[PDB]
């Protein structure tokens, strides 16, 4: 069954290249031979104030981007976190097995406890493997630790998930500060590429990318971060290996690298936007997928909850 | 409708006189003209490690004590907290609106966040009034504060509950240290009266109660705590006012006060134990009450959750 689980918060109008190439692309590669649950984690979004109309719209558009990036509702389950009560039930239980300092080392209560709800999200589905960036790994180790601690009291109750770190070419960096992960956290969106942004706008950002002064196209993330990061992106978006690109770039300057990467990104995001636009305009397809997904997610997660509750001694 | 909500944790084999006279007796007095929900809050119990078999047994026996103390399943809803998923769903939402310091001023995550789940327990039922001792009031003020804060963003979503403080003759103190609330927290159970303990054992504890050196039967909680506390108990258990007892005690010594209170307590707990014993031996009656209660609790609380979710902007 090789069950996997992952998700993204519906906190903006668009995923960026970090999400698409460093998470969803991994999901797409897994869904053929793994039983996959892909979640829009709206409960996590409200740890900061959310506009209600935008929250609902972004929930749908995050799911739509999953489909547009190749997530296949005939092979995977896509669902909205808040529609499955078991997430919060398990999160309460898991919080009772999570040390306070353990969570402090990870402000409102929700901001403090959301790693525990993240653990719940995964453990609720008997998840065997979780694709995650090496920088959001520490949250998963908490999930693994709490699961092991619960299982030591109550043997065999929870699956302890393995961490799936993507290839290093899945790490995408900010184009204006390429020592930093591409993140919505950036000052401006000048170094960030949103999937659903005007493709010409994103191309301009790529042409503007900070490089170095060596004028040597060579992959070395910690000596040439901007040059290396541009190589990551072009490879990940076209499929061409970094070897083939670097060899085809001997003698070339950085201008050639920027133009090519921009063009490849443009050809990447254009079909995505077409699919999202159709899923937004005709929303019955998406809502059917999310409804089927919630029903199947509920069927799995509620049994996990009943098993956990049974072991704790709750009256059923 | 005048809806009320209250509950007790199933953390021991017996409620004590503090619970029976300072909480459940208030509930019994309310259930005739208030729509009442009385909860066995098993989710709170697992903030400390629980033996599974004991947890299940105490859940049932806490409900049985509700019935034996006069809670009427034809007039009130009695249910087990863990059986109603909405408690944890609302608790997650409320935690996102609860300041960290606000909860710190109230260790595992569960120990830290349980005031938020307590707020959820109440607010989930559109509770108009909560009976509580003046010493567990501060938890309810958090519930009221979080409700007001949520309602300021989302007007009219949650009922803000009024606090029902019982008469001061509902405060029951430890018999060995009568400056302290009767609490399971005591060093020994020497100063604590469990409802289901051997009645002769409880009588002995009352005869042993710490008094004073004045040899004057007079109600004054902060000058004569042991003498006053014994007067509380005898009154609350027989219905006789403290005036009638104190006047009938002029010229009397403390020995007479102790004997009388012990006898009255014995006549109080004997019928309770008979009812609990029958509810334990024939458990189908109790389980039917809890099943009906969970169904009605779910019907109310899930609508509160859907309303809260709708206002936040979650996709339904």
From TrEMBL, chains A, B:
Record-level GO cellular component terms: cytosol
Biological processes, Gene Ontology terms: tryptophanyl-tRNA aminoacylation
Alphabetized Pfam families for the sequence: tRNA-synt_1b
SUPFAM superfamilies: Nucleotidylyl transferase
EC number(s) from the headed UniProt entry: 6.1.1.2
Binding site for ATP: 9-11, 18-19, 133-135, 172, 181-185
Broad enzyme group: ligase
Example of a GO MF term: tryptophan-tRNA ligase activity
Protein origin, superkingdom: Bacteria
Catalysed reaction, written as an equation: tRNA(Trp) + L-tryptophan + ATP = L-tryptophyl-tRNA(Trp) + AMP + diphosphate + H(+)
Chief subcellular location: cytoplasm
Gene3D superfamilies for the chain: HUPs, Tyrosyl-Transfer RNA Synthetase
Subcellular location: Cytoplasm
Keywords: Aminoacyl-tRNA synthetase, ATP-binding, Cytoplasm, Ligase, Nucleotide-binding, Protein biosynthesis
Segments carrying motif 'KMSKS' region: 181-185
Residue spans crossing the bilayer: none
PROSITE patterns, alphabetized: AA_TRNA_LIGASE_I
Family recorded in the similarity comment: Belongs to the class-I aminoacyl-tRNA synthetase family.
Function: Catalyzes the attachment of tryptophan to tRNA(Trp).
Subunit structure and binding partners: Homodimer.
HAMAP family: Trp_tRNA_synth_B (MF_00140_B)
The protein's name in its UniProt record: Tryptophan--tRNA ligase
Organism: Mycobacterium tuberculosis
């Amino acid at each position: 069954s090789r069950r996997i689980f992952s998700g993204v918060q519906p906190t903006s109008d668009s995923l960026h290249l970090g999400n698409a190439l460093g998470a969803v692309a991994q999901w797409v590669g897994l869904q053929d031979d793994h039983d996959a649950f892909f979640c829009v984690v709206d409960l996590h979004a409200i740890t900061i104030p959310q506009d209600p109309e935008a929250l609902r719209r972004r929930t749908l558009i995050t799911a739509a981007q999953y489909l547009a990036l190749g997530i296949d509702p005939g092979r995977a389950t896509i669902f909205v976190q808040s529609q499955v009560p078991a997430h919060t039930q398990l999160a309460w239980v898991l919080g009772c097995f999570t040390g306070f300092g353990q969570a402090s080392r990870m402000t409102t209560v929700g901001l403090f406890t959301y790693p525990v709800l993240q653990a719940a999200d995964v453990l609720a589905y008997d998840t065997e493997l979780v694709p995650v960036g090496e920088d959001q790994r520490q949250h998963l180790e908490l999930a693994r630790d709490v699961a092991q601690r619960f299982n030591s009291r109550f043997p065999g109750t929870l699956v302890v998930p393995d961490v799936l770190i993507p290839k290093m070419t899945a790490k995408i960096y900010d184009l204006q500060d390429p020592t930093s992960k591409m993140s919505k956290s950036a000052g401006t969106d000048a170094g960030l590429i949103n999937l659903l942004d005007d493709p010409a706008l994103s191309a301009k950002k790529i042409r503007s990318a900070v490089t170095d002064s060596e004028r040597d196209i060579r992959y070395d993330p910690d000596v040439k971060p901007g040059v290396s990061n541009l190589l990551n992106i072009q490879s990940a978006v076209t499929g061409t290996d970094i070897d083939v690109l670097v060899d085809g770039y001997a003698g070339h300057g950085y201008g050639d690298l920027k133009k090519d990467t921009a063009e490849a990104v443009v050809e990447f995001v254009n079909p995505i936007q077409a699919r999202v636009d159709e899923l937004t305009a005709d929303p019955a397809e998406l809502e059917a997928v999310l409804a089927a997904g919630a029903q199947r997610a509920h069927d799995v997660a509620s049994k996990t909850v009943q098993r956990v509750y049974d072991r704790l001694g709750f009256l059923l």
